[PDB]
Every structure is written in structure tokens, then in C-alpha cells.
Amino acid sequence: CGLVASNLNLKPGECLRVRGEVAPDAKSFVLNLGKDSNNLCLHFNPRFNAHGDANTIVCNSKDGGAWGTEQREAVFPFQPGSVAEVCITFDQANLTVKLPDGYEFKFPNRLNLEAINYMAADGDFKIKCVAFD
Amino acid sequence: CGLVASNLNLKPGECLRVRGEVAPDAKSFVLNLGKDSNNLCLHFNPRFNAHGDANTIVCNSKDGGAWGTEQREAVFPFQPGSVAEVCITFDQANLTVKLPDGYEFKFPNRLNLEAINYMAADGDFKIKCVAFD
Lengths: 133, 133
Ligand SMILES: CCCO[C@@H]1O[C@H](CO)[C@@H](O[C@@H]2O[C@H](CO)[C@H](O)[C@H](OCc3cn(Cc4ccccc4)nn3)[C@H]2O)[C@H](O)[C@H]1NC(C)=O
Ligand SMILES: CCCO[C@@H]1O[C@H](CO)[C@@H](O[C@@H]2O[C@H](CO)[C@H](O)[C@H](OCc3cn(Cc4ccccc4)nn3)[C@H]2O)[C@H](O)[C@H]1NC(C)=O
Known about the structure:
Two copies of one chain form a homodimer.
Chain A lengths: L3 E7 L5 E7 L6 E8 L2 E12 L2 E11 L2 E2 L3 E2 L9 E9 L3 E5 L5 E5 L7 E8 L1 E8 L1
Antiparallel strand pairs in A: 1-11, 2-8, 2-12, 3-4, 3-11, 4-5, 5-6, 5-7, 8-9, 9-10
The complex binds ligand 2XT (2 copies).
Pfam family, one (chains A, B): Gal-bind_lectin
GO cellular component, one term (chains A, B): plasma membrane
GO biological process, one term (chains A, B): positive regulation of apoptotic process
């Protein structure tokens, strides 16, 4: 279990940047953002080799303990054994996730949060820097 | 009120770097480090004007919920309404706190922590970046 941060008070339009090292033998990692562990406006889960999935980004939400409808993206800008940065913002409609190699996508904001107050990391990603703007 | 982080997994000799904004009207700010909120190897409290102190850094420990004996430092390289970086490392004997303008001091590792897993900020300091070397 990785870095957990609370009281982030990330407001709409503000950018959260996370840089970390993807393990050489990475199978998958997770960043979770929301209010708390039961209330996630974004579960961001790059799977290198996990749950039968290869090089696929899986996203979902969690509302009051309940997983939402999973979505998958079609580009995988991560390499095992490399440094990677992820930049996330939000407004009421969407979270915007910016990734390496120029890639960016939106994930619908399915929760009702005023601010993002909680982050949690897990899996094969060693966090080196977190910045809150 | 400020950022709280857990699972930091900071080990001896590793450097924790915290940058933030000292409020324009700053009276006092706090960085706490330790095992958890009740076991602090460092309560780092620069006081511009607070609790009977002017321009003084007060340091303490907290062991099983009980405050230790305060140590007052001899230097104060902080100003209201500025950016500041604090860098912290530790070993068996001491925490070393590096401050702006080349200042540093040591505070004894009273709890004999071999790992720092918790950090929390409070007061007139807005954390903008946290980095691990
Ligand atoms: C009959 C259809 C079954 O579909 C499958 O159902 C699985 C179980 O629900 C889906 O897997 C889950 O997808 C969720 C997002 O939709 C989460 O990713 C679930 O894992 C949550 C989790 C585990 N961990 C610990 C962890 C994570 C990464 C590395 C190391 C530890 N942290 N969060 C993950 O278990 C999996 O994505 C899903 N696959 C498909 C293609 O739909
Ligand atoms: C009138 C003289 C009595 O002596 C005073 O007794 C106080 C209470 O024990 C001493 O203050 C406490 O010292 C502790 C360390 O030894 C902690 O600094 C106590 O504050 C804990 C705290 C409050 N906060 C919230 C906060 C922090 C900064 C700004 C705004 C909110 N966070 N941590 C702080 O209230 C204060 O250090 C002490 N001063 C002197 C000069 O001896």
C-alpha cells in the first residue's frame, strides 16, 4: 500500500501532478482520487499485465462503496522501468487526465464533490513527487 | 487543516522535501512528522508571533499522545508572504532539518524511529509540493 493523502482541497481547475517510477516488472498501479476510500471520483488503473488485461488503462468511480461502470481507454503511454508523470484536473462535468506521450482523456465526474480531498496510490508505481496547484 | 499524508515510507538518510507558501499574515505554521498523529518524532513549529514567542522555531516530540520537552532554535529564516522549502532527513540519533538560506539544525530522534510514515501540515503554510529522494 502506497501514499495516501487527505485534506488536499483540490478545487475545480486546479492541477494535481504525480510523478513516480514504474517498476521494471510492473503489473499494474492505481491512483485513486475523491473524498475517501469509499468515494472515488476517479480510480485510475493502468494494467500492464493484470486481470487478463495487457497494456490497458482501466478507469472507474466508486460512490458510497459501489463501483460504477468501468471504462477503458485505447492508448497506453507507460513503460515498465521508467519514470512517468500523471496530471489531473476536474470540473463538475469531467476529470481530465494528462499522461505521457501527449495523451489526454476525460472521465465523467459521477460524484458530487466540491473539492478532491483524498488521494491514494497502490501497486507498482513508486511516488517521487506530488504537486498541488 | 492542512495536508495529511500517510504511508510515506521515509527511511534513514532519505530526503523529504516540502515546498509551500507562507501566508501573508502568518502567525505560526506547523509540520508534523512521525509514525502517526500520536507519535511524532518532529513537531516543527516556526512562530512569527504565537504562544509567547516572536520569530522562533519551536520543536517538540509527541510519544503516545504525550508532548515532550520543547527545544527552541537559534535561527529564523522565514518571512510572511513568501515561498519556502524545508528538507528533512533522519537517522538513529537525530532529525536534520534544512531550512531556507543555508540554515540547518538537528533535533534528537527521541522515539528512535527507523521509519517516518506520517506527515501533517497546519497553520499559515500552504503545501505546494512534496518530493522524496
Ligand atoms: C464478468 C465480468 C468481470 O469483469 C471484470 O471484473 C473484475 C472484478 O470486478 C474487474 O476488476 C476490478 O476493476 C475495478 C475497476 O472497475 C478495480 O480496478 C478492481 O480492483 C480494485 C483495487 C485493487 N487494488 C489493490 C492493488 C491494485 C493494483 C496493484 C496492487 C494492488 N486496489 N484497488 C478490480 O478488481 C475487471 O476489471 C473486470 N474486467 C472486465 C473486462 O470488465
Ligand atoms: C503563556 C505561556 C505558556 O507556555 C506555552 O504553553 C503552550 C501550550 O502548552 C505552548 O504551546 C503548544 O506547544 C506545543 C509544542 O510544544 C504545540 O505547538 C501546541 O500547538 C499544537 C498545534 C496546534 N495546531 C493548529 C495550528 C497551528 C498553527 C496555526 C494555526 C493552527 N497544530 N498543532 C502549542 O499550543 C507554548 O509553546 C508555550 N510557550 C512558552 C513560551 O512556553
